[PDB]
Amino acid sequence: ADVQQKLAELERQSGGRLGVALINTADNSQILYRADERFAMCXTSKVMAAAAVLKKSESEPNLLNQRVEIKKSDLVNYNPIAEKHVNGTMSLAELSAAALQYSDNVAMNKLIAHVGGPASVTAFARQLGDETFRLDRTEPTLNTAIPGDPRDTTSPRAMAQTLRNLTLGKALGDSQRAQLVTWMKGNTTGAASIQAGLPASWVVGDKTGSGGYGTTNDIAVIWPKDRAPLILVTYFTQPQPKAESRRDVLASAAKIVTD
Numbered sequence: 001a002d003v004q005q006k007l008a009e010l011e012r013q014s015g016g017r018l019g020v021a022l023i024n025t026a027d028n029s030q031i032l033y034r035a036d037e038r039f040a041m042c043x044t045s046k047v048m049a050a051a052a053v054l055k056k057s058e059s060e061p062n063l064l065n066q067r068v069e070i071k072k073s074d075l076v077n078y079n080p081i082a083e084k085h086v087n088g089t090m091s092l093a094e095l096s097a098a099a100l101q102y103s104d105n106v107a108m109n110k111l112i113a114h115v116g117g118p119a120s121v122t123a124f125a126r127q128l129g130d131e132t133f134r135l136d137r138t139e140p141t142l143n144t145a146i147p148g149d150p151r152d153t154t155s156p157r158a159m160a161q162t163l164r165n166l167t168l169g170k171a172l173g174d175s176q177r178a179q180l181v182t183w184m185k186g187n188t189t190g191a192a193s194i195q196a197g198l199p200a201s202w203v204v205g206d207k208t209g210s211g212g213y214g215t216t217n218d219i220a221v222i223w224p225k226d227r228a229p230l231i232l233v234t235y236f237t238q239p240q241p242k243a244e245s246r247r248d249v250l251a252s253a254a255k256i257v258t259d
């Protein structure tokens with residue numbers, strides 16, 4: 001009850017719409033707030049795309065080493081790693097790391113294209129038992145985040161359950177699961193989001209996202225000191241098209257649900 005009141009007060013102060021799902025594997029419990037509503041995923045969808053490539057690699061051993069050409073025509077609106085490789089190639093492993101650890105949007109588009117497009121990433125989610133996730137578009141348009149638009153959305157409940165399967169469960173083979181966890185633990189974009197609301201000693205693998213309407217998101221697997229792991233999804237979006245990012249709201253939500 002107190003946790004619910006605190007999340008409601010945070011949402012009201014923020015001026016926007018907040019979605020939270022925590023899974024505590026110590027006791028198989030959940031803390032949920034707007035957890036069945038849809039939110040634009042933005043960059044957080046890169047986890048599903050990278051996982052689809054990892055699954056494909058289980059039956060194709062040379063897959064992560066496969067080379068992909070990077071051209072000026074591939075550049076989109078945020079290309080921190082790919083811009084350094086124009087006119088050469090990157091491997092699928094390198095593209096996966098760039099997408100997950102730097103939010104590189106060219107890298108996301110190469111993962112999407114490799115597996116057959118947004119409908120193939122969605123069909124992979126369905127094969128895992130996630131019947132909520134939908135990836136409709138490529139970068140950069142998947143980030144528009146218009147209120148009421150179901151494109152490129154999922155719910156906090158669904159994304160927490162799927163992230164648990166991918167990182168702690170058996171969706172991927174042992175080598176592939178370990179690779180995903182290692183990539184997420186090395187993320188560089190998350191220190192002001194969920195991590196900022198947790199003790200310094202806790203270990204985190206996370207993926208952030210941001211987009212139109214001040215959309216500010218983070219999804220994480222968390223190893224608290226001497227405790228069973230947690231899965232946490234914090235999604236946030238605002239009423240104004242040009243609203244600024246609010247990573248502090250995600251930090252505040254993480255503190256509330258883990259105190």
Ligand SMILES: [Cl-]
Pocket residue numbers: 240241242243
């Ligand atoms: Cl505005």
